[PDB]
Amino acid sequence: DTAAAIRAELAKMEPFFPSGLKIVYPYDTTPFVKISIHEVVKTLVEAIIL
Amino acid sequence: LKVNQDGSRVLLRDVAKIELGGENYDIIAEFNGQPASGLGIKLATGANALDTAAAIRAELAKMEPFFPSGLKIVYPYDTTPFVKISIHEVVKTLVEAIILVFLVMYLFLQNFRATLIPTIAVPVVLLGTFAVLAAFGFSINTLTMFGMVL
Amino acid sequence: AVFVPMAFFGGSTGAIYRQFSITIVSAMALSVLVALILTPALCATMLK
Amino acid sequence: GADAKTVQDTVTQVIEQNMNGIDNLMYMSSNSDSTGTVQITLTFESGTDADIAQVQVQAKLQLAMPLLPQEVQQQGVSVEKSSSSFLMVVGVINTDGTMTQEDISDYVAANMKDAISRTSGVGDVQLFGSQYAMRIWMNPNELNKFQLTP
Amino acid sequence: DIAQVQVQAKLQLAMPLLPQEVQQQGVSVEKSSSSFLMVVGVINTDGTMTQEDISDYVAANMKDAISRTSGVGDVQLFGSQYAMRIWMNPNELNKFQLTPVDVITAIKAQNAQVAAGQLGGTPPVKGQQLNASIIAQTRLTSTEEFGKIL
Amino acid sequence: GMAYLFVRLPSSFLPDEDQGVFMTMVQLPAGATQERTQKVLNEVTHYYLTKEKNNVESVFAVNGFGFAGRGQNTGIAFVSLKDWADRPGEENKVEAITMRATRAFSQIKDAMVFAFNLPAIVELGTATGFDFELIDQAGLGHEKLTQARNQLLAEAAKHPDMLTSVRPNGLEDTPQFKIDIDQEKAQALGVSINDINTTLGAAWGGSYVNDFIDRGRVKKVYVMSEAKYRMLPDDIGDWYVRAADGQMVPFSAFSSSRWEYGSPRLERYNGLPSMEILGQAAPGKSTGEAMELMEQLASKLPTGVGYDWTGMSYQERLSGNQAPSLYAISLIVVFLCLAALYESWSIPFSVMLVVPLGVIGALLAATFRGLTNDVYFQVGLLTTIGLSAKNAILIVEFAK
Amino acid sequence: GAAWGGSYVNDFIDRGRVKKVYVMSEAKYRMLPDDIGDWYVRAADGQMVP
Ligand SMILES: CCOc1ccc2ccccc2c1C(=O)N[C@@H]1C(=O)N2[C@@H]1SC(C)(C)[C@@H]2C(=O)[O-]
Ligand SMILES: CCOc1ccc2ccccc2c1C(=O)N[C@@H]1C(=O)N2[C@@H]1SC(C)(C)[C@@H]2C(=O)[O-]
């Protein structure tokens, strides 16, 4: 939720950049929690079908 | 400040006027075109409003006796009496809702005892509501007292 | 179910629709407690 | 004494870069007048405990205090709970033994002002006048007479 | 929340017995969690700039906003914010007979904002028409103006 | 008819009540003094005293402190009206009193005097009203932010459009007396730059020196100057700074006199410079429409100019987005609870269209009289759903 | 202290945002131990001293 509001401020900053300035994303914790929800609720559906 | 050659003394009053006046002359009030000051107390963001204003008169009351000749307190802009009117014209409306209901219960049913069971029913529920709002967190606001009438 | 979900408040209007139900909602369950207890009793004990 | 853009980057901006690491925050506004008075308003989420929220804001101002003018340090720096609006506004006048709109303002600030702001959790008190102070009025012509400066 | 306050309400008492260099520098009491999560890189592709021009823009636009938002513990800038940097040549100092002490005095005199008063002051004479704020010394802006310090 | 008496019925938050107390503020133009604003504060006090004896008990004027901020131009009088019993009619009520008061201050006056209601509530929640703010995101100055704000206010007033009302919060822009002290001229004659800065600073602006004692209580000591030696620009040269060579030196020797243009109120939003724009919604449009038709004007402005909505308003309103969600779940659970005690797929629907029976009548009394869909009316609807379900459940319970 | 380690002097303004001013020295006059003697401190008798 803290990392979601890191993109809140960052998003309003993007349009007022000079020529060339671009954002890039190394070391990120965000997508690991999206995989922990999509491979557990998917396992939830695989437990019901079986 | 100085001691000029011939033994003459330059004092601070000799070079400058010295009067005991205010630290800030940017603002000056006038109660009905009369020289006055004041104390504009503002709330503390979550305070109890009228309970804070009751203790404003607590300190003020002990200050009154030790005033000089002429000094007297006056009360403009006041929030206190508006809450006293919101209690006296809602609990008065509470009594007007019971008396009017008493006439409706008597017209349909001529029994005096029949116009008495509902008369004791609703006051008991009104008091029980005060006990729930006290146990949870709420107070006797302008809103929750309007909820008693509705 | 009409009052309590209306009292799920959002924003600076926090204690407006909130206190607008829970206040009167306690009065509903105290009047159902006054209609399941008490009113049954007073009617049987003393009427005609 | 400082003008608008003097206080805008010597007091105001210094605090703004050091107004970080605070739990709960929607936005931050600011003002800077030509009279020499700055006032920031760090608004929090709805009903965020004003007790702990006040501490975090004034435990950060402290780190930026050493990089301000020495004039502003000795002056009144204050972090108080706000509620834009007054409630009790107690006027003070004289009838019999007449005094000015300055003698009255000193007595209010030297007897009943310190007691009122401390009692029953008051946010912030605004004195409508000024407390007394040893005021001096340096004449520039008399300074040149004995060869002196402020 | 409360644990952070007690630690920084004790550091404050020991602050006066530290070097004056450390007081004006960044003293900070922040909540820690040894490990990063979001590490937003910033580069250039088209209009190329250095690894210093980019670090200034990050610290002068998006750093103050990030640390304040949604309760961040502490932000670590991977670079540095810009600053009027000077590189004293020791051979050129000896040419005109000077020291680093005389250079520091020249910047703490010309590069400094002063709080002047105002025409038609706080206690004016009855009948003044105008009232404006006086401006005196202004803090230097560009690299050219620092080069012309006498 | 239930739908038609709802959309056309306007949306408020809370009715502005008679609180036995109101107030009015003052604002003088660029570079006014304490004496000029006192003339305006007297004429306002006379309208409430001699021309309104029956309705006003007292007044509490103030010279140089409005609710905008501070300065010698501003002001505020705090009216305390007489009790409710002695004020019988609607003429002697806050609405009518502040109506003809504002007319009197716009007719026989040459300044900006007004008079507003005592809303209760807070400063927010005006209903059909917004609060915009114009941010400088890039590295522009104050002079560049001023031109961007004048293009935003002008564009709103030049192509309306179920029109509008837009004015700034307080950036009237007044002159400032700059004094350029030439550094090389000063050191030649032998005067320290330190001594000159506290000669100008202490004399005109004042200076905190030391704490003394007066009648027991510790107070402050201030040093400044007699009023007559610091009014006009010509009194700068009267001050003589001392040099190292034991002789006086006038201020006119090294200094240089010239006027400029600054601002008496520099506002900043979130670490960057900014300027508040206080505009409201139209008489036709209402909030959601007005804000999105101010957003595309902000995008048409020059480079390095963004925006952000500051700053009471809002996050999610009441008759807007919230109400649909509140009434939505209210139907979902009402249907479920008319089944735990009934058991069917017909009984719940009978109670679920007694809703529009009580609602058509509620919207009839509010739309006919001069009331509106605010807080007190909105919850009056849900009481009607509890009394329409109650009565209809008696019709369904005994009949089944 | 100011030459080798640097020194915080005063705050200035750059493009709106208030930043810091630092005074130190060109890199080549503070690398090795032999560059200590290049710095000349001023005495009260108006002459330099290594
Ligand atoms: C589930 C029953 O949640 C309730 C019920 C009654 C309440 C009566 C009073 C105050 C809260 C509540 C809450 C409650 O916990 N909700 C909230 C909570 O957290 N807060 C609110 S109100 C608030 C603005 C004071 C504060 C905040 O946002 O910081
Ligand atoms: C109080 C609402 O003042 C309003 C409100 C809305 C308006 C819509 C259109 C045209 C004018 C106004 C004014 C208007 O004419 N006011 C003028 C002004 O200047 N100020 C005012 S209000 C103020 C106190 C914020 C400020 C100040 O004195 O610093």
PDB file of N, CA, C and O in Angstrom, chain F residues 85-131:
ATOM      1  N   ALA F  85     -35.826  35.795  21.061  1.00  0.00           N
ATOM      2  CA  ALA F  85     -37.160  36.288  21.402  1.00  0.00           C
ATOM      3  C   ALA F  85     -37.407  37.712  20.899  1.00  0.00           C
ATOM      4  O   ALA F  85     -38.496  38.021  20.412  1.00  0.00           O
ATOM      5  N   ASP F  86     -36.394  38.570  21.015  1.00  0.00           N
ATOM      6  CA  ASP F  86     -36.509  39.973  20.604  1.00  0.00           C
ATOM      7  C   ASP F  86     -36.395  40.178  19.086  1.00  0.00           C
ATOM      8  O   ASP F  86     -36.624  41.286  18.595  1.00  0.00           O
ATOM      9  N   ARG F  87     -36.033  39.121  18.357  1.00  0.00           N
ATOM     10  CA  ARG F  87     -35.994  39.143  16.896  1.00  0.00           C
ATOM     11  C   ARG F  87     -37.105  38.244  16.340  1.00  0.00           C
ATOM     12  O   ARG F  87     -36.912  37.034  16.206  1.00  0.00           O
ATOM     13  N   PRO F  88     -38.262  38.824  16.018  1.00  0.00           N
ATOM     14  CA  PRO F  88     -39.438  38.034  15.629  1.00  0.00           C
ATOM     15  C   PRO F  88     -39.427  37.519  14.185  1.00  0.00           C
ATOM     16  O   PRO F  88     -39.500  36.308  13.979  1.00  0.00           O
ATOM     17  N   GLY F  89     -39.332  38.425  13.213  1.00  0.00           N
ATOM     18  CA  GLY F  89     -39.551  38.083  11.817  1.00  0.00           C
ATOM     19  C   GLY F  89     -38.335  37.547  11.085  1.00  0.00           C
ATOM     20  O   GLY F  89     -37.252  37.415  11.659  1.00  0.00           O
ATOM     21  N   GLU F  90     -38.528  37.243   9.801  1.00  0.00           N
ATOM     22  CA  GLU F  90     -37.450  36.771   8.931  1.00  0.00           C
ATOM     23  C   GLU F  90     -36.533  37.917   8.492  1.00  0.00           C
ATOM     24  O   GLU F  90     -35.425  37.677   8.011  1.00  0.00           O
ATOM     25  N   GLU F  91     -37.004  39.153   8.650  1.00  0.00           N
ATOM     26  CA  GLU F  91     -36.187  40.337   8.380  1.00  0.00           C
ATOM     27  C   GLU F  91     -35.069  40.460   9.414  1.00  0.00           C
ATOM     28  O   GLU F  91     -33.960  40.886   9.090  1.00  0.00           O
ATOM     29  N   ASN F  92     -35.369  40.076  10.656  1.00  0.00           N
ATOM     30  CA  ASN F  92     -34.401  40.121  11.753  1.00  0.00           C
ATOM     31  C   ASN F  92     -33.705  38.769  11.967  1.00  0.00           C
ATOM     32  O   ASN F  92     -33.492  38.339  13.102  1.00  0.00           O
ATOM     33  N   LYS F  93     -33.356  38.113  10.862  1.00  0.00           N
ATOM     34  CA  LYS F  93     -32.663  36.825  10.869  1.00  0.00           C
ATOM     35  C   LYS F  93     -31.390  36.965  10.026  1.00  0.00           C
ATOM     36  O   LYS F  93     -31.361  37.744   9.077  1.00  0.00           O
ATOM     37  N   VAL F  94     -30.345  36.213  10.378  1.00  0.00           N
ATOM     38  CA  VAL F  94     -29.007  36.367   9.778  1.00  0.00           C
ATOM     39  C   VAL F  94     -28.998  36.490   8.246  1.00  0.00           C
ATOM     40  O   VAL F  94     -28.196  37.241   7.695  1.00  0.00           O
ATOM     41  N   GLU F  95     -29.874  35.753   7.565  1.00  0.00           N
ATOM     42  CA  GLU F  95     -29.941  35.795   6.099  1.00  0.00           C
ATOM     43  C   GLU F  95     -30.282  37.200   5.585  1.00  0.00           C
ATOM     44  O   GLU F  95     -29.586  37.736   4.721  1.00  0.00           O
ATOM     45  N   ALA F  96     -31.353  37.780   6.120  1.00  0.00           N
ATOM     46  CA  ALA F  96     -31.798  39.121   5.730  1.00  0.00           C
ATOM     47  C   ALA F  96     -30.883  40.247   6.229  1.00  0.00           C
ATOM     48  O   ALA F  96     -30.792  41.296   5.591  1.00  0.00           O
ATOM     49  N   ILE F  97     -30.214  40.030   7.361  1.00  0.00           N
ATOM     50  CA  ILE F  97     -29.351  41.048   7.967  1.00  0.00           C
ATOM     51  C   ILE F  97     -28.063  41.226   7.161  1.00  0.00           C
ATOM     52  O   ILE F  97     -27.620  42.351   6.931  1.00  0.00           O
ATOM     53  N   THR F  98     -27.475  40.110   6.735  1.00  0.00           N
ATOM     54  CA  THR F  98     -26.257  40.123   5.922  1.00  0.00           C
ATOM     55  C   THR F  98     -26.541  40.429   4.450  1.00  0.00           C
ATOM     56  O   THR F  98     -25.614  40.673   3.678  1.00  0.00           O
ATOM     57  N   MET F  99     -27.817  40.406   4.062  1.00  0.00           N
ATOM     58  CA  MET F  99     -28.219  40.728   2.693  1.00  0.00           C
ATOM     59  C   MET F  99     -28.119  42.231   2.446  1.00  0.00           C
ATOM     60  O   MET F  99     -27.427  42.671   1.525  1.00  0.00           O
ATOM     61  N   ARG F 100     -28.810  43.011   3.275  1.00  0.00           N
ATOM     62  CA  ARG F 100     -28.809  44.472   3.150  1.00  0.00           C
ATOM     63  C   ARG F 100     -27.564  45.129   3.760  1.00  0.00           C
ATOM     64  O   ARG F 100     -27.350  46.329   3.584  1.00  0.00           O
ATOM     65  N   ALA F 101     -26.756  44.348   4.477  1.00  0.00           N
ATOM     66  CA  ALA F 101     -25.478  44.829   5.002  1.00  0.00           C
ATOM     67  C   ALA F 101     -24.431  44.887   3.892  1.00  0.00           C
ATOM     68  O   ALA F 101     -23.690  45.862   3.787  1.00  0.00           O
ATOM     69  N   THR F 102     -24.376  43.836   3.075  1.00  0.00           N
ATOM     70  CA  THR F 102     -23.459  43.782   1.930  1.00  0.00           C
ATOM     71  C   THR F 102     -23.806  44.819   0.862  1.00  0.00           C
ATOM     72  O   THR F 102     -22.919  45.318   0.169  1.00  0.00           O
ATOM     73  N   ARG F 103     -25.095  45.129   0.727  1.00  0.00           N
ATOM     74  CA  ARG F 103     -25.553  46.155  -0.208  1.00  0.00           C
ATOM     75  C   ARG F 103     -25.117  47.551   0.241  1.00  0.00           C
ATOM     76  O   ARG F 103     -24.776  48.397  -0.586  1.00  0.00           O
ATOM     77  N   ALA F 104     -25.130  47.780   1.553  1.00  0.00           N
ATOM     78  CA  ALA F 104     -24.741  49.067   2.127  1.00  0.00           C
ATOM     79  C   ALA F 104     -23.234  49.316   2.038  1.00  0.00           C
ATOM     80  O   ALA F 104     -22.799  50.466   1.988  1.00  0.00           O
ATOM     81  N   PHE F 105     -22.447  48.242   2.020  1.00  0.00           N
ATOM     82  CA  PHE F 105     -20.988  48.348   1.954  1.00  0.00           C
ATOM     83  C   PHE F 105     -20.470  48.402   0.514  1.00  0.00           C
ATOM     84  O   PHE F 105     -19.311  48.750   0.286  1.00  0.00           O
ATOM     85  N   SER F 106     -21.324  48.050  -0.447  1.00  0.00           N
ATOM     86  CA  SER F 106     -20.982  48.139  -1.867  1.00  0.00           C
ATOM     87  C   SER F 106     -21.493  49.440  -2.493  1.00  0.00           C
ATOM     88  O   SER F 106     -21.115  49.780  -3.615  1.00  0.00           O
ATOM     89  N   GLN F 107     -22.344  50.162  -1.763  1.00  0.00           N
ATOM     90  CA  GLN F 107     -22.955  51.396  -2.258  1.00  0.00           C
ATOM     91  C   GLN F 107     -22.175  52.627  -1.799  1.00  0.00           C
ATOM     92  O   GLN F 107     -21.686  53.402  -2.624  1.00  0.00           O
ATOM     93  N   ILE F 108     -22.061  52.795  -0.482  1.00  0.00           N
ATOM     94  CA  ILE F 108     -21.425  53.978   0.109  1.00  0.00           C
ATOM     95  C   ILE F 108     -20.033  53.662   0.671  1.00  0.00           C
ATOM     96  O   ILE F 108     -19.713  54.008   1.811  1.00  0.00           O
ATOM     97  N   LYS F 109     -19.210  53.007  -0.145  1.00  0.00           N
ATOM     98  CA  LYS F 109     -17.836  52.671   0.238  1.00  0.00           C
ATOM     99  C   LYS F 109     -16.932  52.490  -0.984  1.00  0.00           C
ATOM    100  O   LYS F 109     -17.402  52.178  -2.080  1.00  0.00           O
ATOM    101  N   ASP F 110     -15.629  52.680  -0.776  1.00  0.00           N
ATOM    102  CA  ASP F 110     -14.638  52.576  -1.850  1.00  0.00           C
ATOM    103  C   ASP F 110     -13.569  51.529  -1.512  1.00  0.00           C
ATOM    104  O   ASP F 110     -12.376  51.739  -1.745  1.00  0.00           O
ATOM    105  N   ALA F 111     -14.017  50.400  -0.968  1.00  0.00           N
ATOM    106  CA  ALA F 111     -13.133  49.288  -0.619  1.00  0.00           C
ATOM    107  C   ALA F 111     -13.837  47.941  -0.830  1.00  0.00           C
ATOM    108  O   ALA F 111     -14.862  47.871  -1.514  1.00  0.00           O
ATOM    109  N   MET F 112     -13.276  46.878  -0.253  1.00  0.00           N
ATOM    110  CA  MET F 112     -13.839  45.532  -0.364  1.00  0.00           C
ATOM    111  C   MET F 112     -14.309  45.045   1.008  1.00  0.00           C
ATOM    112  O   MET F 112     -13.570  44.370   1.728  1.00  0.00           O
ATOM    113  N   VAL F 113     -15.539  45.412   1.361  1.00  0.00           N
ATOM    114  CA  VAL F 113     -16.174  44.956   2.596  1.00  0.00           C
ATOM    115  C   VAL F 113     -17.335  44.030   2.250  1.00  0.00           C
ATOM    116  O   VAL F 113     -18.071  44.276   1.291  1.00  0.00           O
ATOM    117  N   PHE F 114     -17.494  42.971   3.041  1.00  0.00           N
ATOM    118  CA  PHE F 114     -18.487  41.931   2.770  1.00  0.00           C
ATOM    119  C   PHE F 114     -19.244  41.570   4.056  1.00  0.00           C
ATOM    120  O   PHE F 114     -19.500  42.452   4.889  1.00  0.00           O
ATOM    121  N   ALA F 115     -19.596  40.284   4.204  1.00  0.00           N
ATOM    122  CA  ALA F 115     -20.374  39.784   5.340  1.00  0.00           C
ATOM    123  C   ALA F 115     -20.887  38.398   4.970  1.00  0.00           C
ATOM    124  O   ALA F 115     -21.652  38.252   4.012  1.00  0.00           O
ATOM    125  N   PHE F 116     -20.464  37.390   5.728  1.00  0.00           N
ATOM    126  CA  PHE F 116     -20.786  35.996   5.418  1.00  0.00           C
ATOM    127  C   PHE F 116     -21.572  35.348   6.553  1.00  0.00           C
ATOM    128  O   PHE F 116     -21.552  35.823   7.691  1.00  0.00           O
ATOM    129  N   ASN F 117     -22.262  34.258   6.227  1.00  0.00           N
ATOM    130  CA  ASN F 117     -23.063  33.527   7.212  1.00  0.00           C
ATOM    131  C   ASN F 117     -22.159  32.761   8.173  1.00  0.00           C
ATOM    132  O   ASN F 117     -20.952  32.665   7.956  1.00  0.00           O
ATOM    133  N   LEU F 118     -22.755  32.233   9.239  1.00  0.00           N
ATOM    134  CA  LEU F 118     -22.053  31.364  10.180  1.00  0.00           C
ATOM    135  C   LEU F 118     -22.474  29.925   9.858  1.00  0.00           C
ATOM    136  O   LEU F 118     -23.499  29.451  10.353  1.00  0.00           O
ATOM    137  N   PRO F 119     -21.697  29.235   9.018  1.00  0.00           N
ATOM    138  CA  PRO F 119     -22.142  27.959   8.440  1.00  0.00           C
ATOM    139  C   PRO F 119     -22.297  26.812   9.435  1.00  0.00           C
ATOM    140  O   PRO F 119     -23.114  25.925   9.183  1.00  0.00           O
ATOM    141  N   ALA F 120     -21.546  26.845  10.536  1.00  0.00           N
ATOM    142  CA  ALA F 120     -21.312  25.667  11.370  1.00  0.00           C
ATOM    143  C   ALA F 120     -20.361  24.759  10.582  1.00  0.00           C
ATOM    144  O   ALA F 120     -19.388  25.260  10.007  1.00  0.00           O
ATOM    145  N   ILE F 121     -20.622  23.449  10.543  1.00  0.00           N
ATOM    146  CA  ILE F 121     -19.870  22.543   9.674  1.00  0.00           C
ATOM    147  C   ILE F 121     -18.360  22.801   9.858  1.00  0.00           C
ATOM    148  O   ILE F 121     -17.868  22.786  10.988  1.00  0.00           O
ATOM    149  N   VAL F 122     -17.633  23.021   8.761  1.00  0.00           N
ATOM    150  CA  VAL F 122     -16.270  23.550   8.798  1.00  0.00           C
ATOM    151  C   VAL F 122     -16.180  24.615   7.691  1.00  0.00           C
ATOM    152  O   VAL F 122     -17.190  25.248   7.368  1.00  0.00           O
ATOM    153  N   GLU F 123     -14.994  24.834   7.123  1.00  0.00           N
ATOM    154  CA  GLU F 123     -14.862  25.689   5.942  1.00  0.00           C
ATOM    155  C   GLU F 123     -15.243  24.932   4.665  1.00  0.00           C
ATOM    156  O   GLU F 123     -15.652  25.546   3.677  1.00  0.00           O
ATOM    157  N   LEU F 124     -15.112  23.605   4.692  1.00  0.00           N
ATOM    158  CA  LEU F 124     -15.448  22.765   3.540  1.00  0.00           C
ATOM    159  C   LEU F 124     -16.951  22.505   3.453  1.00  0.00           C
ATOM    160  O   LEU F 124     -17.713  22.880   4.346  1.00  0.00           O
ATOM    161  N   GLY F 125     -17.361  21.853   2.366  1.00  0.00           N
ATOM    162  CA  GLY F 125     -18.740  21.433   2.188  1.00  0.00           C
ATOM    163  C   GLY F 125     -19.679  22.588   1.913  1.00  0.00           C
ATOM    164  O   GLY F 125     -20.724  22.713   2.554  1.00  0.00           O
ATOM    165  N   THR F 126     -19.306  23.431   0.955  1.00  0.00           N
ATOM    166  CA  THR F 126     -20.132  24.573   0.566  1.00  0.00           C
ATOM    167  C   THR F 126     -21.287  24.124  -0.330  1.00  0.00           C
ATOM    168  O   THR F 126     -22.341  24.762  -0.349  1.00  0.00           O
ATOM    169  N   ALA F 127     -21.078  23.025  -1.060  1.00  0.00           N
ATOM    170  CA  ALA F 127     -22.053  22.477  -2.008  1.00  0.00           C
ATOM    171  C   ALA F 127     -22.191  23.377  -3.236  1.00  0.00           C
ATOM    172  O   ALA F 127     -22.498  24.563  -3.114  1.00  0.00           O
ATOM    173  N   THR F 128     -21.977  22.796  -4.417  1.00  0.00           N
ATOM    174  CA  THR F 128     -21.820  23.558  -5.658  1.00  0.00           C
ATOM    175  C   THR F 128     -20.681  24.568  -5.496  1.00  0.00           C
ATOM    176  O   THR F 128     -20.848  25.766  -5.732  1.00  0.00           O
ATOM    177  N   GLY F 129     -19.524  24.057  -5.079  1.00  0.00           N
ATOM    178  CA  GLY F 129     -18.351  24.874  -4.810  1.00  0.00           C
ATOM    179  C   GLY F 129     -17.082  24.045  -4.698  1.00  0.00           C
ATOM    180  O   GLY F 129     -17.098  22.953  -4.123  1.00  0.00           O
ATOM    181  N   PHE F 130     -15.982  24.567  -5.242  1.00  0.00           N
ATOM    182  CA  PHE F 130     -14.706  23.851  -5.260  1.00  0.00           C
ATOM    183  C   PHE F 130     -13.553  24.694  -4.711  1.00  0.00           C
ATOM    184  O   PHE F 130     -13.744  25.841  -4.302  1.00  0.00           O
ATOM    185  N   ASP F 131     -12.362  24.101  -4.688  1.00  0.00           N
ATOM    186  CA  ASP F 131     -11.137  24.811  -4.333  1.00  0.00           C
ATOM    187  C   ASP F 131      -9.966  24.255  -5.150  1.00  0.00           C
ATOM    188  O   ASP F 131      -9.449  23.173  -4.862  1.00  0.00           O
TER     189      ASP F 131
END
